[PDB]
């Protein structure tokens, strides 16, 4: 067991191994806050998240077990993984706080588009990386379901990572598939591809595609572009009968190869939307499309999800996961 040290940051105390140094807050993450730190064991900059009251609420123990389960399973270049997980507690009886750590990324796509324009080469590569992540994630039966620009971490080298997947406010409404926002069906994995559509269009243009003002306006903006629901549609669960825009006419000056993909992703009927694995092979990504480098995740056990156990068992399950953690090859 390494020696820890304490220090208060945004008015809470952090207890970390000596290896992580010069800890500095960088904002909020899912159910906690995160610091950028220097790892004196490896020489790399890392991001450290300390989760909030992990075993206070019942959801919290479940939410805390859930994240650490997902983060221990995700091993992919475009998907945030765990370099390390630690707690200051020396046995289960004092197990109270949990810290997660990952490679430090410099920005998220919200900050990028808010300070630059982006070429077709940029959106080519960025979008590419998201659906490689999504292929991997979807392949383990995990849905992001809240995919949005602030959930996409990026580097100075244009490298992208998905985070906060499988864990699920005002901003987030813009990228949600319609059937989810308004509880139309049971949600399948393509829900994320809708978000991908919204993001790609917003990366190209610089402006949010469907900035709906409330639940009602959102649909109006939705239907304004993609058209009214076709034949089936209502057979899968009263306003103006708008027609479907020819996407080429909206995204002027775009690579026509890019708009054809946008057309395939922003299809109202979930059954019709393109899939991540499908979307990868399309010709817009032909420059980066490499079937021999687009891997699938190992099977991942979600059995605990249907399970109703006590917080002390959830806590023991997480502590078990913390203890069993095997750091990656240095």
């Amino acid at each position: 067991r390494p020696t820890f040290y304490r220090q208060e940051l945004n008015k809470t105390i952090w207890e970390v191994p000596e290896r992580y140094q010069n800890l500095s807050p960088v904002g909020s993450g899912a159910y906690g806050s995160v610091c950028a730190a220097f790892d004196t064991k490896t020489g790399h900059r890392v991001a450290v998240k300390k989760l909030s009251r992990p075993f206070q609420s019942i959801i919290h123990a479940k939410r805390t077990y859930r994240e650490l389960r997902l983060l221990k399973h995700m091993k992919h270049e475009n998907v945030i993984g765990l370099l390390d997980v630690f707690t200051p507690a020396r046995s289960l009886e004092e197990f109270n706080d949990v810290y997660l750590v990952t490679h430090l990324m410099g920005a998220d796509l919200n900050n990028i588009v808010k300070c630059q324009k982006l070429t077709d080469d940029h959106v080519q590569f960025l979008i590419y990386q998201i659906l490689r992540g999504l292929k991997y994630i979807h392949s383990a039966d995990i849905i992001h379901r809240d995919l949005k620009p602030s959930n996409l971490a990026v580097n100075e080298d244009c490298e992208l990572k998905i985070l906060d997947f499988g864990l699920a406010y005002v901003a987030g409404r813009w990228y949600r598939a319609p059937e989810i926002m308004l509880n139309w069906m049971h949600y399948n994995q393509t829900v994320d591809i809708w978000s991908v559509g919204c993001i790609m269009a917003e990366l190209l243009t610089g402006r949010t595609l469907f900035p709906g003002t409330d639940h009602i306006d959102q649909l109006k903006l939705i239907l304004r572009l993609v058209g009214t629901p076709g034949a089936e549609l209502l057979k899968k669960i009263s306003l103006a009968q708008m027609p479907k825009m020819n996407f080429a006419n909206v995204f002027i000056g775009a690579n026509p190869l890019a708009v054809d993909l946008l057309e395939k992703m922003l299809v109202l009927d979930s059954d019709k939307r393109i899939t991540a694995a499908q979307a990868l092979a399309h010709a817009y990504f032909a420059q980066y499309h490499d079937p021999d480098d687009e891997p699938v995740a190992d099977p991942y056990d979600q059995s605990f999800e249907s399970r109703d156990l006590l917080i002390d068992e959830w806590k023991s399950l997480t502590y078990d996961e913390v203890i069993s953690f095997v750091p990656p090859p240095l």
Partner: peptide, 19 residues
């Protein structure tokens, strides 16, 4: 409404500026 691209499509390594 139509939405044109930030940089119009033109018919070799990528980077972004960090905040």
């Amino acid at each position: 409404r139509v939405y044109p691209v930030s940089v119009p499509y033109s018919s070799v390594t990528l980077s972004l500026v960090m905040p």
